[PDB]
Amino acid sequence: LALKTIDWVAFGEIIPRNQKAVANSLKSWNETLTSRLATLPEKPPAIDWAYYKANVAKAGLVDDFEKKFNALKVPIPEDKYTAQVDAEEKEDVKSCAEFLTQSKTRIQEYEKELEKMRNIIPFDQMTIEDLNEVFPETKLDKKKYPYWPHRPIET
């Protein structure tokens, strides 16, 4: 009966677009069942065995059923859905292992390139080759345009 806190707005960011429908469906399951539990009380009250025996002139059926009832015990349902927990962990892998290190390396890369930006000498100091290697997009790819100026003039 341990029910935990949720920031549903963040939760909504969780699922891919594919399963969002079932996600919201089970969310509605949650709310409806929560309210439904709020409806009924915790326990079915005691049966007035004394009063029944008093009014109920029946010989022993009163206390007969009293005892039998008190003996009978309900079948508590058993955890069977309670199995997909590895999902969490394997999801944890996808995010914390299969995504943590890949994102990390993407960063270390981007970090490196960035810090490789502040080290660029002031343009006054630079020289065409400086741009060429800094921005290969400023290359003139002479292999495609071996003749001067190596770019379509209209370009």
């Binding site: 009966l1 341990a2 029910l3 935990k4 949720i6 920031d7 963040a10 939760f11 960011e13 969780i14 699922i15 996600a23 089970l26 969310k27 399951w29 949650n30 069942l33 929560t34 439904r36 539990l37 009924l40 009380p41 915790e42 326990k43 079915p44 009250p45 049966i47 029944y52 009014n55 109920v56 029946k58 059926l61 009163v62 059923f65 009832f69 009978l72 309900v74 079948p75 508590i76 349902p77 955890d79 859905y81 309670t82 997909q84 927990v85 999902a87 969490e88 999801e91 944890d92 995010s95 914390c96 995504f99 943590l100 994102s103 993407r106 960063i107 981007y110 970090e111 960035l114």
Partner: protein, 54 residues
């Protein structure tokens, strides 16, 4: 950089979904439990009410 950081933060809450699933299923089992109790109480009281009315 910041988009990647955002993904990293989003990873933290990547478990909440299953937390919700667990809460729902467990409380549904509790629902079945409680309703079974109330229903047995109902049936016994009704059955004895039969004879009281008789």
């Amino acid at each position: 950089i910041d988009m990647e950081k955002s993904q990293q933060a989003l990873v933290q809450k990547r478990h909440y979904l299953f937390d919700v699933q667990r809460n729902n299923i467990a409380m549904a089992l509790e629902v079945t439990y409680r309703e079974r109790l109330h229903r047995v109480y109902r049936e016994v009281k009704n059955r004895l009410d039969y004879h009281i009315s008789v």
